[PDB]
Amino acid sequence: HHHHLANTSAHDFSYLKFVYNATDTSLEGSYDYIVIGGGTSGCPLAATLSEKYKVLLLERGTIATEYPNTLTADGFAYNLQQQDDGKTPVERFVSEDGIDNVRARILGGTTIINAGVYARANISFYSQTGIEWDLDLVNKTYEWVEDAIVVKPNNQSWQSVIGEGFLEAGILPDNGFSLDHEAGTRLTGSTFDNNGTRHAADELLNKGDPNNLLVAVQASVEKILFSSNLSAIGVIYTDSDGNSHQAFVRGNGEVIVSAGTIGTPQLLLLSGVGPESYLSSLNITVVQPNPYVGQFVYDNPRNFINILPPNPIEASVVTVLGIRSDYYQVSLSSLPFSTPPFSLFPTTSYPLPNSTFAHIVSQVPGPLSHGSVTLNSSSDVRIAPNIKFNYYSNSTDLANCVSGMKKLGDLLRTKALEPYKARDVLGIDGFNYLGVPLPTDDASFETFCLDNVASYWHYHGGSLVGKVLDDSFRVMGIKALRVVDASTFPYEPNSHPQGFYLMLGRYVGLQILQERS
Template sequence: MKFDYVIAGGGSAGSVLAARLSEDPSVNVCLLEAGGDGKDLLIRAPAGIVALLPGRPKINNWAFETVPQPGLNGRRGYQPRGKALGGCSAINAMLYIRGHPTDYEGWAEAGCKGWSWKEVLPYFKRAEGNQRGASDLHGADGPLRVAEQQSPRALSRAFVAACGENQIRANHDFNGPEQEGAGLYQVTQFWGEKRNGERCSAAAAYLHPAMGRKNLTVITGAQATGIMLDGKRATGVRYRTAKGEAFAQAGREVVVSGGAFGSPQLLLLSGIGPAKELAAQNVPVAHDLPGVGKNLQDHLDFITSWKSRDTDMMGLGLRGMVNLVKHMLQWRKDGTGMIATPYAEGGAFLKSDPGLERPDLQLHFIIAIVDNHGRKMHLGYGFSCHVCALRPYSRGEVTLASADPLAAPRIDPRYLSDERDAALMLKGAKMMRNVLEAPALAKYRHKELHTTGLTGDAELMDHIRSRADTIYHPVGTCRMGTDDMAVVDPQLRVHGISGLRVVDASVMPTLIGGNTNAPTIMIAEKAADLMKNTVV
């Protein structure tokens, strides 16, 4: 099969890009996705992430693991990644966060021309269909529906009040003029229409409405295994389905869109990457590109939980089962109720020091007990809070575990390898505890599950190392830039290989200060324009 564009990966970026490119009826686009169509009930019902995220069993989830992490007392970390059209936007908490404007100024200052805040804001706005309407900072007509939460719990509002009791001001819009403060998150969720209360994944927003186009071919259950090369030009993608091996030829460009783990893995499997590493795996070197897989950055996250006697939250108990049925019926009727919850209803962006220019910590407040990514269950009811350091200094890498294209990549985030990250995590954990112990949450607190009795810094830090893990924001492994370690240029073209781009979170030079899904969609929106304006 021959197409103009072949996109390997139907996640958040791939879904956006396939839809935007196929708006031009004169071009033919092929999208390859290893997972399913992203339309099942567990995806559409926001609360369904309780079944998707743990990866036991692996439903719409790659459920990767890291190598043992010395900074986490030798534990392996867990890395859930979406495996369906829509990618991680099909299994995430739907939080709509762009990061801080200075994050993008930093990209531009580092040589990524065209990626300053002023230059990326129009793409955020073009994507966004915000329930609050249009403004200087928001779009109202974009395909990605951005909603107020349907039925936030009183508990989440109490969290915001508890932040206020810790001199953290209220903030109605984390994507507004100021990021700092506490409030309820806006979410990528359908609002005010027939699908009210359903998850609005990138596939639901962009791709599913476009799949009737004659010039768009979407192949699910198709895992990309290699990039076809003619010398230093990409000509197509090899992939594998249940029927066997196949390939899709690209007359114009191949786009790799497998995310921070999948994109470097596919490049490496194709012989594009550090020559010595490729040789060690007996992969023939097609192009020595030393930065492939390097520069891995992620938000390490620490959670603490409280049991509660209140039952107006998600929990395991007889009343919870009765309520679950009631809320499911309500959600099917009008899209409201607890099935519409993102779980992480409340949040805050904090400064560890008042003199800082921008927040360096983020809180996610959960209306349930969350332990080990939901893989360790607790009877009863309760709430949890996450804290993460927004701009870690630690850098890791993604490499090949083997030359088998169906094997998982070797993921080594090197969490807390820089002691500055450990110091900030410790400070953030103490600030989070102060919020959770504030009077506004007194009626909900019953028993703290993890950190009771840990008073000294050394004890608390050891506890953080024994329980902290990702909050699912890996980026940077195909870094954008112009230096020798950059993988793609500011047009997202792979250095040294024509007809090949990478479009996803892996191109981020540095991690943004917040959740990464909205920025990934922005990257794809901008990439579509870059590609449409390219004369091949």
Template sequence: MGWFMEHFIRLFLAGSLFFNGLSYSHKASKYTFIKEARVAPPRSTYEYIVIGGGSCGCPLAATLSQGGKVLLLERGGSPYRNPEEINIQKFVHSLADTSPSSFSQQFISTDGVLNSRARVLGGGSVLNAGFYSRASYSYIRESGWNESLAESSYKWVEKKVAFEPPMMQWQTAVRDGLLEAGVLPYNGFTFDHLYGTKVGGSIFDKEGHRHTAADLLEYADPIKISVYLHATVQKILFRYNQEKRKPQAYGVIFEDALGVIHRAYIGSKMKNEIIVSAGAIGSPQLLMLSGIGPANHLKSHGIQVVLDQPLVGQGMADNPMNVLIVPSPLPVEVSLIQTVGITRSGSFIETASGLGFGHSWTDRLRGIFEFVSNQSGLPPKFLPEAMESVADTIRSLANPILKGGVILEKIIGPRSSGHLELLTNKPNDNPSVTFNYFKDPEDLRMCVEGMKTIIKVINSKAFSRFRYHNMPVQALFDLMLQLSVNLRPKHPSAAFSLEQYCIDTVLTIWHYHGGCQQGKVVDHNYNVIGVEALRVIDGSTFHGSPGTNPQATVMMLGRYMGQNIIKRRLSQGRK
């Protein structure tokens, strides 16, 4: 049993790095207004230019098209080009493909944690585990959003992309285990963020088809919107507004897949604007590449400074994820995130099951580490021993599909934060990102409490038939501590510590945010402070991740702000 269990843990743990990217879609929708950037005119003019067709950019552009002529620029391709490409059976390919046309771009934070960012129309909603849950009411109020408009915006999104998932045996056992562990009350199925245990929504329908933020473009006016794929924005253009005495955005330069340069402008009307929705990594990176950021840092990369703004790239945070892998003596269903325990201690407990991986996945994972560590010709940031340790874990993976599931915790917030810096002045290159996982002791306390809750769930009567009774939970910790799940230093110790376990085995749950925070880089209307005709609207403006999963709120924000912008435009037109 010992070899089998260790083999299973190695196999499943590697999968846990990517379980949140599972992707299943049979929809092959076509929009006449979605085209390759290579057919774009050399110069064009719009009332709104939205940079980034992700979870926020798609609903934002669709809404704005109801009030003006809109251009949406997306650096990736279409999720509709081949429905099987993002089928659940192909999730590994979608996440691990390092080709220029892939939907996912991998990077390793300076913390030594493997991560990825979306590069596809629909953004992270094309790659994630599909969990759909709204922000808490307190988060909505603290963000300064109108509660009624936020509610209607959520419902607008949910009509297209949110569903009640089918609850099967594994998810039910974890749900009942959470209740037995005291994560109360039981709130049933709900999109709302409520203390206790609930079943959340999913962007997978009952047939298992994925619905993404790109589907929200069905709301767009096809006459007033143009969407260009493989359109990589090189920089935002500025001129000096003498009346306002500040820089004013007036256009963008973007490159198509053939390397041809195109220019798009917003005209001379003051109510026209450019909106950056390139995500928590892409938005601060693009502001810097365009000359808005810390002056000395920009000058070191040969970038002309438009506005010295030292807070661009600051406040980068990623909700840390820590997991336990639970091998099962019984067959389990393939399930993504459905059950969640929202604790009062500040941690969220979630689960997935039935994931299996083979040799082809092993080869791709090895390729990711080689690709990311060697890209840009930069010197390696991590010790060779650490890279080799990860390689050993990868090499240990084998072909069989084994039974079991993963129970994970992430913490609210987090309080710990870091920063983003440019490594090159090329927009397709990853910047350097530091998240400073568990730098704040309160984050570590919440992780420990979350892991204690997971232990209670595994030991619960409700979950008993899905665990090997001759293998105590401590054995799962011991085996996982022997594995290399990231490039962080390991601290083996005879005295087991949940604190050190959290630090050493931290993974990402892909909920990073910050870099263009509200009140620091943008104002309460998401206008970039100190600049005219430029906004940033996406998760880079958040101070904390909303709820148990941010995608519902990011999509809501696109709709919410689109309506606000149109309302403002109409009121200006009446003056």
């Protein structure tokens, strides 16, 4: 079941032969499919559709060769440390809760900037949704992604320490190496290969048909165009010089929005698809009223402590996961820095580490708390929308963080972690901490959870199946319009969702092709 995994190899940019600047007006015209957003779901979706049909993929960012630190594990922090000048692969934002965050702006989407952790969805997820999944095809599609960009990670000293700690702390059983989201401790896959080269969703464009697939970069899609039976017919997009362009679908073809949790509700709202009284209050003509566009937007909380060992530890990428139903835990080890990677810590005024440190982390599942995306500009898609997640508004989320923080306490008490204490005392105050240490009444853990929350970066929702979309990802009430990306589900598929959303892009592409045949 692992014969098919990818090998160590250079990042494959062969697909650049059909990538063009959106300034090229000859890209304007009619296609069978237009995919908006060249990201985690959008790239394998476009590649899949191009097996049989003419596809235009539109991405607002540029190509990853322009930002070489996106292409190595060693460059992960660099892209977050880099200032956001409107063109960089990392776009910075702050939720209305006050928590710093980022999204991608690059061909390949968030797989070009993320921490590389690869996992398949919790196998119970499919029946939880109630969608009639073709489960055999789901698994074939995971293998199609994994053959291109997923490896079995080599050993990393810190990842092995934390795995021994998770097991000693009772996060059982030992699952060895496995891609599956199951209770226990395991080594999972990575989209960094064993030479440190990042592999990503853009490489899945290499599986497209180069005679049928066209990609426009620095293409800012501003509006979905509709028929004068309401149908999507095309898009308006602007190029890096600011000039406008139009592209259309033809016949039985379709527009699919794959612009992410933030970008997809924004574009739907700008296009008149959304809550009637809200759009009317902005004087946006309503094309399709739906009270849920931009509603039910979720961000799984990240809580953490940081330890500063008295001897240097080796930096690592996350590969070893400790999974329970009520918390998902990992640890990153890092070099010190004097410029913070934006959103690693929730505020810019966080203390800076002067030596190597271990960031020890727990994730709240769900979450049950949710907020919304609303427009900041009623016209300009380059102006980021407002986004609020309402962290810990739901008491179940807070209770689950308390459980995870207690388990992090257990982890710090293991023999495995003992050699990284600065003082050989009995308690966990023998560690040196960067930032706030763990407090053991439930009230002190609740305060810690609330005060020190950060984004796990795994936000989702805003165009949910069952609210905005049907079980085939069609926008209800509109022909020839679908949404495929992380805006579509209200809960996580697992601890690390890129593997699910990579699969989903191709999977829905195959469903489109089958429906059409």
